[PDB]
Structures are given as structure tokens and as C-alpha cells.
Ligand binder design. Structure first.
Ligand code: MG
Lengths: 48, 334, 84
């Protein structure tokens, strides 16, 4: 359905990450794509 | 029973299949880094993740066995590098659950010992376990592989590997093997510290000494890199022979078995076999297929463990970077 | 403390349970600095991180996603799970 990450710093300000279908395609292929996309968002969130 | 074994505690990744004393498959890959560099946990775990599933299917296909022909899944619980141990364990745990098979967490040293005992047919030897990660003198007694002697700092293989890095010697097929080939051409014996501590050994001092002797050579050139490979081997192997002999004498052992990556070295084998000859003892040594870390050694120790009633529930399957040889209850021996 | 929560959906509750069974046993390498907790409800795997350091929290989350990707590839290539 949806892969999501929620970061809450020591300040208390919450930052959300999310990756966007159960159709004819392979379910694990879709999940692998989401995980790879989540790695990019986590990198982008923590780098600055 | 047939056991599927997973190994990737250092820079070697392998999947083995063992069935009633027969190795049915043993594919393996080695993570080779540029000369002068050492493999890091992060990059090593990345290499292992990229090839582990290819090795698993290679092992299944070569063995002729399918998922449901496998009776047990064995994997290295430890010791070793953190990131690579976790990557191998997550796969072992997944296939165990998928196929609904039991799981057995194996101690890396017991893997080497059990494979050593299977291949060579050693009855009651004094065991010398030498690699890049370990240096121990072991003897089986009352359901324990007891540590009689060991390195108090770095493993003998770590001393050899780091010396190859300072001389910028190739890591292909292994820094150890290339040190060994260079040592054969050595003509001058350079004196080095001899640091035996009763039944224990030390290699930190020898490595720092030979590092300084190497930097002296690149600047003055009194000797050759071949002389230093020869000299390092003569010192570290004579020290390993001494502590093995001291353990053999204290237990009345008539057999000696060398296991681990450094056990591949024909010069160390020659030196140990000579000490054994003068004592009236036998020297046992495995070949290139099994001296280096491999999945079949894990499947073999796993086979012994599974039959005796050892099981690792998933909740207790967590890997340990420190797992001592004497911490396993050897219930498969009398 | 620095907190990170990850929610991962799986095709079936059994595949979520298998991923939990495979990923949960390992202790974090720097336990005093970064800790994590894994739970599973239905098809959802929930990972909860608590950290003292931001860089080591990023490293832990990235390392986990790489292990999760490997587990997903294992289930795809060597599955489906046999009936039990
Ligand atoms: Mg080894």
C-alpha cells in the first residue's frame, strides 16, 4: 500500500517521508522499488 | 540428513550442501580489494548481499537437492564482522521460514574444526586454528572445544594481511597466498621479535617492527620484499609451532590438525609436520577447497549439531561479533 | 531523543511475519547510541528507532533498508512460503 517514515527530532518538529499499485505487476518488484526510493528520501532528510 | 550451510563472516561468502559426510556443493566468492587496502565491514556486507542468492541457487542446483530435500538450515552465528554476519543470517532465517525448516546458529571455529575432522579423519588432535580473525590452540575435552592458548592481540592472518598492505602486495587470490609465493624467493633471514607467552602468542609487536623494517627498505634497500615475506613467515610460524607443541605435550596428543585460512600455507604445514615428525606424531591438514571460509564447513558442524538436538529459535538467532569457541556444548561427541 | 518510525507493507500477513522473524533477532551495533524495535500487525512491519546521534540514526535506517531489500529478494526468488 504505502511505505512511510516519520522523523521526530529532539526539538519535537515532525518530518514525514512517503513512497507511493496492486495491479497485474509483481508485488515484490513494487516493494523493492519503494525500499530503494525510501533509501533516497532518508539520505535527503538526514544530509542537511 | 542434508544440511544447507551459509558462511560470510569475513570477506569470503559461501553456500554449502552436506549430506551424511558428503559435500554435495560448496560455491564461494571472495571480496578482493585493491593492493594496500583492507576490506571494510560495510563494503564487505554489500558484496555479500549482491551474490548470496546466486550462490544459494548454485548450491541447490549443483547438489541436485530441492528445498524440501534439505533437513536443516545452518548459518554462522559468529564470531566475525557485524554487517556481513547480519546479511548472511537474514537470508538463512528467511529460507528456514519459507521452507519451514529448523535453523542452527554455528560457531565459525567449530565449523572449521568439524570440516577439518570430516575431510582429514582426525581422531583426537590438538587443533591449531589460524586465520585473519582467529589464532587459537584448541583441544576437545568433556563436551567443550577448550582454548589452551591464543593470541592476546591480533590473529596471525591479520599480521600477514596488514604486512601485505604496507608492501602494497596484491589481495588476489589472497594477501596471505601472495606473501607465501614471495617468501619462496626470499634469501636473507631478517631477525624479528619472537613473542611467545607460555601457551599464548602476540603479533602486534612483530607487525610494528617489520613495518619499520619495510619503510627502512623502501628508503635504503638492504634487503628485498621477498626476504621480509620469508622472514615474517619463519618467525610467526615457528611461534605457532611452539604453542601447538606445548599443548600437545600437556595432553599427550599424537595428532595435530591445522584449520583456518592460514592452514593453507604449505610452509607452515611443513614446519608443523616437522615438529610432529620429531615427536612421533601425525600432522593433519585440509586442502584449498576447505582451509578458507566456506559454506560446507557450516553445513558440516550444523549436521553434527542438528542430529545431537541443537536448535536455534528465531528469537535467539541474533548474530554475535564475539562468540568464543568454548561457549558451545559439544553434545555430538563423548 | 531522535525518533524514526518506518512502516512497511507486505503482500500477505505470513510474508510480513517472515520478514519480522528474519530482521528482528539482531542487536543494533551501537546499542547505547541507537536502538530499534520491530513489531508486526497484519501485513505491516513497524520499525521504531530511538537515537542519541543523528548520523548514526541515518546509518542504522539505511543499513536496515538494505537488509529488508535482501529479505524481499529472498522471498521473491525462493518463495512462496510452503503451507504450514
Ligand atoms: Mg575462518
Amino acid at each position: 500500500m504505502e511505505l512511510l517514515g516519520e522523523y521526530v527530532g529532539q526539538e519535537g518538529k515532525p518530518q514525514k517521508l512517503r513512497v507511493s499499485a496492486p495491479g497485474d505487476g509483481d508485488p515484490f518488484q513494487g516493494l523493492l522499488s519503494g525500499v530503494a526510493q525510501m533509501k533516497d528520501m532518508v539520505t535527503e532528510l538526514f544530509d542537511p | 540428513p542434508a544440511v544447507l550451510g551459509f558462511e560470510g563472516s569475513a570477506n569470503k561468502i559461501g553456500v554449502g550442501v552436506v549430506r551424511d559426510g558428503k559435500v554435495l556443493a560448496n560455491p564461494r566468492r571472495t571480496y578482493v580489494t585493491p593492493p594496500g587496502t583492507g576490506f571494510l565491514p560495510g563494503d564487505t556486507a554489500r558484496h555479500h548481499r549482491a551474490v548470496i542468492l546466486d550462490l544459494l541457487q548454485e548450491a541447490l542446483t549443483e547438489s541436485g537437492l530441492t528445498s524440501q530435500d534439505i533437513d536443516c538450515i545452518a548459518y554462522t552465528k559468529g564470531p566475525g564482522m557485524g554487517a556481513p554476519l547480519v546479511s548472511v543470517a537474514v537470508v538463512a532465517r528467511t529460507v528456514a521460514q519459507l521452507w519451514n525448516k529448523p535453523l542452527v546458529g554455528v560457531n565459525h571455529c567449530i565449523g572449521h574444526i568439524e570440516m577439518g575432522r570430516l575431510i582429514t579423519g582426525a581422531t583426537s588432535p590438538t587443533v591449531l586454528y589460524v586465520s585473519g580473525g582467529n589464532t587459537q590452540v584448541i583441544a576437545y575435552s568433556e563436551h567443550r572445544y577448550r582454548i589452551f592458548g591464543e593470541t592476546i592481540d591480533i590473529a596471525v592472518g591479520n599480521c600477514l594481511d596488514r604486512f601485505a598492505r604496507v608492501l602494497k602486495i596484491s589481495n588476489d587470490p589472497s594477501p596471505g597466498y601472495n606473501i607465501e609465493q614471495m617468501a619462496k624467493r626470499g634469501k636473507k633471514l631478517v631477525e624479528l621479535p619472537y613473542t611467545v607467552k607460555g601457551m599464548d602468542v602476540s603479533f602486534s609487536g612483530i607487525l610494528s617492527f617489520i613495518e619499520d623494517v619495510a619503510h627502512r627498505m623502501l628508503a635504503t634497500g638492504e634487503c628485498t620484499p621477498e626476504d621480509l615475506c620469508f622472514s615474517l613467515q619463519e618467525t610467526v610460524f615457528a611461534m605457532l609451532v611452539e604453542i601447538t607443541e606445548r599443548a600437545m605435550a600437556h595432553c599427550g596428543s599424537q595428532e595435530a590438525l591445522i584449520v583456518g585460512g592460514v592452514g593453507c600455507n604449505v610452509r607452515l604445514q611443513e614446519m608443523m609436520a616437522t615438529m610432529c615428525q620429531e615427536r612421533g606424531a601425525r600432522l593433519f591438514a585440509t586442502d584449498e577447497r576447505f582451509c578458507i571460509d566456506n559454506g560446507a564447513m557450516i553445513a558440516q558442524a550444523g549436521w553434527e549439531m542438528f542430529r545431537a538436538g541443537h536448535r536455534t529459535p528465531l528469537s535467539d538467532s541474533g548474530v554475535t561479533q564475539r562468540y568464543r569457541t568454548d561457549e558451545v556444548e559439544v553434545t555430538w561427541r563423548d | 531523543p531522535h525518533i524514526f518510525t518506518l512502516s512497511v507493507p507486505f503482500p500477505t500477513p505470513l510474508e510480513a511475519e517472515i520478514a519480522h522473524g528474519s530482521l528482528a533477532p539482531d542487536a543494533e551495533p551501537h546499542q547505547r547510541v541507537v536502538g530499534k524495535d520491530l513489531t508486526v500487525s497484519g501485513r505491516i512491519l513497524v520499525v521504531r528507532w530511538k537515537a542519541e546521534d543523528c548520523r548514526l540514526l541515518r546509518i542504522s535506517v539505511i543499513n536496515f533498508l538494505d537488509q529488508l531489500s535482501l529479505v524481499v529478494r529472498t522471498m521473491q526468488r525462493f518463495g512462496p512460503p510452503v503451507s504450514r
